[PDB]
Amino acid sequence: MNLHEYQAKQLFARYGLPAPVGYACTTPREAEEAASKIGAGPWVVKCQVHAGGRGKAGGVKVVNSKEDIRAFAENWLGKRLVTYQTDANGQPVNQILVEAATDIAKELYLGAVVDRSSRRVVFMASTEGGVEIEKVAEETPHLIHKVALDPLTGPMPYQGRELAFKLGLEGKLVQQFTKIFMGLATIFLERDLALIEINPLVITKQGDLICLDGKLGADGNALFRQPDLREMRDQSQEDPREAQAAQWELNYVALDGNIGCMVNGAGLAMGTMDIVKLHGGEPANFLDVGGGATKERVTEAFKIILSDDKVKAVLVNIFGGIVRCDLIADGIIGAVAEVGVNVPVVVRLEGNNAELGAKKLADSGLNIIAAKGLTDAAQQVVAAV
Amino acid sequence: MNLHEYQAKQLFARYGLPAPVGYACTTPREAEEAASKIGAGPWVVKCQVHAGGRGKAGGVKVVNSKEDIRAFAENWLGKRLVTYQTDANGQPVNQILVEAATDIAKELYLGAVVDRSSRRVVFMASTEGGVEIEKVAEETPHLIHKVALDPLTGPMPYQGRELAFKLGLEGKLVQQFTKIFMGLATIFLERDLALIEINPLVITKQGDLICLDGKLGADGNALFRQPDLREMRDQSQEDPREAQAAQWELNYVALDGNIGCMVNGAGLAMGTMDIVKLHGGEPANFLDVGGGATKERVTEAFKIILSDDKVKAVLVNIFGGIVRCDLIADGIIGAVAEVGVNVPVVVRLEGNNAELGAKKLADSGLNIIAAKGLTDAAQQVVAAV
Amino acid sequence: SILIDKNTKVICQGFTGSQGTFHSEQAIAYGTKMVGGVTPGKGGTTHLGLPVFNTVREAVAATGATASVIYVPAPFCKDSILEAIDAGIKLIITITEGIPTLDMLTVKVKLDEAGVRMIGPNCPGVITPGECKIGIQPGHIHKPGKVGIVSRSGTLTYEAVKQTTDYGFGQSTCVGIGGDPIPGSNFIDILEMFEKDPQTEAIVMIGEIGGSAEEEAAAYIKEHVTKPVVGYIAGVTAPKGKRMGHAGAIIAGGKGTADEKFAALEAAGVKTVRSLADIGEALKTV
Amino acid sequence: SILIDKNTKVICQGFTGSQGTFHSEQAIAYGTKMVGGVTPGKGGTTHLGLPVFNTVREAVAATGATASVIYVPAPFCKDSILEAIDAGIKLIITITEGIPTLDMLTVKVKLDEAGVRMIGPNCPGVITPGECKIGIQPGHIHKPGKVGIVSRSGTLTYEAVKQTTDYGFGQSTCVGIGGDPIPGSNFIDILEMFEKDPQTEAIVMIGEIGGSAEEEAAAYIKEHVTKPVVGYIAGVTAPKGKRMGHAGAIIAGGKGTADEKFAALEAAGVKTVRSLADIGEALKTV
Ligand SMILES: CC(C)(COP(=O)(O)OP(=O)(O)OC[C@H]1O[C@@H](n2cnc3c(N)ncnc32)[C@H](O)[C@@H]1OP(=O)(O)O)[C@@H](O)C(=O)NCCC(=O)NCCS
Ligand SMILES: CC(C)(COP(=O)(O)OP(=O)(O)OC[C@H]1O[C@@H](n2cnc3c(N)ncnc32)[C@H](O)[C@@H]1OP(=O)(O)O)[C@@H](O)C(=O)NCCC(=O)NCCS
């Protein structure tokens, strides 16, 4: 789960880390009134969307007058912003962060993630601030320094200093950096974070470290013990259908193709999408049926897949699971007649009563094609289009 | 701004007030797994919508098995619940609260609100728990006891004790109640609440006071200093158009009529709706134009009013304001043009250049009727339908 | 003529901000005696030709103004209202919209205890046609006269202003008491200032849904208001339990409906008008 | 045959709950040696005919089981995993889905330090056709044989199981390592158990996007696996930076794509298959 910049900044403030003075606004009036609450200009105005590359898209600006602030707000609130990290629709801007401008001396990079490989929370620092860190890591991997939190001891100051020195900081900047490393490391462990990114971590002309931007990711699996974070979720940033699916114990992710897929199992779902690709098809979505393929759940899945008009055919592929195939075939039919499915549905059943069910489908009369095995079913749907 | 029951219960917990053990769930699996976390049955399952009368609508039940819990969750998540306090659409259920059942001995009523008349925060207690408090107050007003917080001293224990005795509590129940009074009074002043309602405040068979239900309202004007509450807002419970309007500094409230109104001024807006009613019309919405009647703002207002299909005509009524009447007429045309308004728009301008503007409207060659004064404009729209 | 007049010297708190600047030029040009303004940190400078002070007290000394107009954002309004009460301003006019209900609840108690007068908050202001203008209302629609008006709505006032200017009557002083749940002055406070005003021959009392200020004034009018009173209540078509723009405009627990207010104004023998179109017309009957 | 067999005595933690009960009957019917189960507060009772204990230690004493299967909800899984480690269970199989990544990170460290083995979490389990079944997988599609399988996906395993049963090969032991970001046993730990297993003539290694467990195993395979290995990677058509059902199934920072994994499996000379339909087919070539 992602957080907005303004939400991360609030969190930093709670742990005493430094961020610029700012206010999150929902109306142009709030936006323009933030001016004088902050002080003398100029000010930074930033659209608040989960994606990055907001700068490039023109969603971040430095302005000089209260009027310019109002103008920005008017221009964006309620609109969708498309950056190179958002799909083609972009994400809805419902808040503008208005903060004080910062006198930038130098731009650094500080970040942490769980390293799957070493099974540790790893922190990374670099002097290449203001650049997408994956570029740096590919081109100049030697400019990224790392430390790993020891689960036995927790973050230690020596690790903070280590990074501080490798970046070539000295004096009070070494203390400041250490304290920030310690803060972030703690927030990470305490709030069950999955990812932290301060890009850029700035050294101000006046000689202090300050977190200009902030990007947090929380581990969804831990929300049951992160009540505050739970409340901070902003569904407006996600494809609504994803949440809708989740209520029904389905894992949905839309793609661009014309062949819908309904499979039970994350692996089998990804496999099915691939074999349809192999045979010239274009998968239109990933949908994993978590719950038992009951009538109600299967109906729901159909509603969701078909919410997209690019869909020309649907491939159902159900291996085993805790529901007898004949019952599944039953549900698939009700689903089709009740939802009013127009496109042709290819089905591949496997397990208890697989053949009895495939007959039920075939005798139904509807445009349901019972496939004889994976590859056939693949060819069938690809063919149906 | 309203809060969900589960949210108020969390807040009570923070201030040490007693509420039953429970869990807010977003999937039937979470719901069913809450069972064993809570303990032995039976359990209460409650849909979480801002409105009341959830019981009646069958949104609250006591169940005996994990399966029953799952069943309830599956039946409601994602659906809208209609109670006698929701409009005809009802509110979307996105969470089920699953808490332990309570052995009820007696049901009381505790609540607080800002009494406009006496200019104080007033607390009310009654032995008539489990009943809509406005009934009790009309039929048997002498059954409701009140106390008022002294702004000079803050809530004092003697006030908590008085109510406790007037309700006829004695022993440890007097203490418990005093403490609850003190907590709620505090939360009220600290979180800038507008309203508090514990209905029912229960006395358990085991002899303790416990808050079975909770209903809080926060003063929206104070959210700038209630960061946690700001995060707790659930836009899903409101008419989306209301929020959409607010981004544009417009106050919108949908009604059922076929004559849309766009006025500048809350009072003039309510007046306009009334005079249209007087002359046989049926107001379809209240919309107060907060910002300057600028082209962009006027366009937006049109989009919102017309989002409703019952609308057959639109009455614009703009008196003074900080925009020259001829510029307003310009914007109204550009709005009708960009939006593509099918229904007839009656306009009443008044102030600088009112004469000039009305001409611009009439010469435009669009379905715009410039009215000569309030009553005429009223008759005109009523007529146009 | 009540509250203000050609002689009232005024300072503006929040004087160097957007609204403050703008609406001050308008008051200057109308001839209101703006003697200066306050904006912490800008003391010792001039703005719109007047002197700017760091504190309300420094201003009161250097000018001897007695009324203050506030154009300060909600978050700091309580501080500024209380500072003015402290530096001895006897009349406070607060335009600001959005002040937390609980702040006003405290501020009200202070106001009454310290004998200070406040019109607002969340209101258009106050004007005495020809002599003084403190607020956002457009000056050119009023004309020196004999009708006094108190209103919870600002725009509704402009309708009534206009009607009484056209029917030739004119206005003594126009008072916008504001749209908040707990204002600093309600109906009865302003009603009674008119009853004792020679220049005011009749009164136009405009209210709306929510609260019981109308009802309470009704009862008061019957027993202590002698001059003729014509009232209008907005919000008959309003749904229950929904804020209608104004923070104070909401029917709560079924109380404060447009109709009960009409009913009770009539009982006190007030000329109620069902269409704000005929406000002028009803005044012709007095 | 690795990990378990006809002789492995098993206890179930979360034994009296929904999934625990159900999948235990399935194991009991398959002939697995369930000797009992643990559910705090239900010690001293019987369920499915076996004894139920209050703590994992009491169970280990009274039965001498050495492996534990966990059907305990996420929130309490880390506590129960550590309870088992601490009562001396040498083999832990965790079905549970949704355990916080940070809990696993700590649990992993303790597993390795204490010499305990854990398959999971968020996995189907482990089965040795004919002798033992611990998990949710359907027992009737496997058949005693010579192919060993390790997979991050459970359902994908069933495709491969089926194919190898039909081409008549059968399976030695099927291992589902789970779909989480940090599992208790990865590819190389299970690969190596097969290399040393007489009953296993060839290996089917199934992976998906995210992480680098495939690649790392590839490198290991090249240098230490001698038996023939056929691998399949799911997720070629997957979008970047999106969890695909499995918590561990996500392409992050452009790393862990289906293709790099294939590429690296081929370098180590592994029989990759682009269609999971031809897994059986490729085994015919060995
Ligand atoms: C109060 C209101 C007008 C202020 O808006 P604004 O002028 O755009 O706000 P600005 O930031 O431009 O100006 C506010 C000024 O108050 C100053 N200020 C802040 N605290 C102060 C204090 N305690 N004392 C004095 N001045 C203070 C600020 O410094 C600022 O001046 P600066 O900009 O020179 O620093 C606006 O918030 C409001 O309530 N608008 C609604 C008014 C309305 O529509 N009313 C109903 C009529 S019916
Ligand atoms: C673990 C999971 C299976 C539990 O679901 P469940 O069986 O419905 O859960 P229930 O509440 O019914 O039962 C859990 C039991 O654990 C018990 N329990 C809790 N903590 C425990 C602990 N530390 N030790 C022992 N037992 C414990 C509970 O008391 C309960 O039993 P009870 O009902 O007798 O009290 C479920 O959370 C889950 O993780 N599902 C996803 C499974 C999956 O798909 N895996 C991947 C396969 S590819």
Side-chain angles (χ1 to χ4, degrees), chain B residues 116-117 119 219 221 224-225 242 255 264-268 270-271 273-275 277-278 286 319 348 350 352 374-375, chain C residues 75 98-101 103 105 153 155-156 158-159 162 181 210-211 216 232 235-237 244 246 248 275-277:
Chain B
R116 281 231 239 173
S117 167
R119 310 187 292 301
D219 171 12
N221 271 8
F224 72 78
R225 69 185 182 204
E242 280 176 35
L255 281 64
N264 64 313
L268 192 48
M270 283 189 281
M273 280 157 74
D274 287 349
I275 197 160
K277 184 42 144 53
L278 197 54
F286 158 95
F319 194 135
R348 183 298 187 92
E350 191 63 71
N352 259 57
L374 208 59
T375 326
Chain C
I99 297 185
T101 296
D103 283 351
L105 188 155
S153 172
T155 42
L156 271 181
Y158 309 168
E159 288 292 353
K162 172 95 173 325
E216 298 183 345
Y232 173 59
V236 182
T237 68
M244 302 300 281
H246 286 160
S275 167
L276 75 147

Side-chain angles (χ1 to χ4, degrees), chain B residues 29 33 36 66, chain D residues 14 16-20 38-40 42 71-73 76 79-80 95-97 122-124 136:
Chain B
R29 172 172 150 188
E33 280 171 37
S36 273
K66 297 174 172 175
Chain D
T16 60
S18 303
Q19 298 308 288
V38 196
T39 285
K42 291 183 175 158
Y71 287 102
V72 168
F76 323 100
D79 175 54
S80 66
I95 308 306
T96 303
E97 184 284 315
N122 186 24
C123 84
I136 58 175

Side-chain angles (χ1 to χ4, degrees), chain A residues 116-117 119 151 219 221 224-225 242 255 264-268 271 273-275 277-278 286 319 348 350 374-375, chain D residues 98-101 103 105 108 153 155-156 158-159 162 181 210-211 216 232 235-237 242 244 246 248 275-277:
Chain A
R116 282 233 245 166
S117 169
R119 308 187 294 300
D219 167 19
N221 279 9
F224 75 78
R225 62 182 183 206
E242 281 176 37
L255 279 64
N264 61 313
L268 195 50
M273 278 156 70
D274 289 348
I275 197 158
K277 186 40 146 52
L278 197 51
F286 158 91
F319 194 129
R348 183 297 190 89
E350 191 66 67
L374 209 58
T375 325
Chain D
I99 299 189
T101 301
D103 283 349
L105 188 153
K108 178 52 169 173
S153 172
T155 47
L156 271 185
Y158 312 164
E159 288 291 354
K162 172 92 175 323
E216 300 183 343
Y232 170 65
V236 181
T237 68
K242 292 214 52 70
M244 301 300 285
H246 285 159
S275 169
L276 73 149

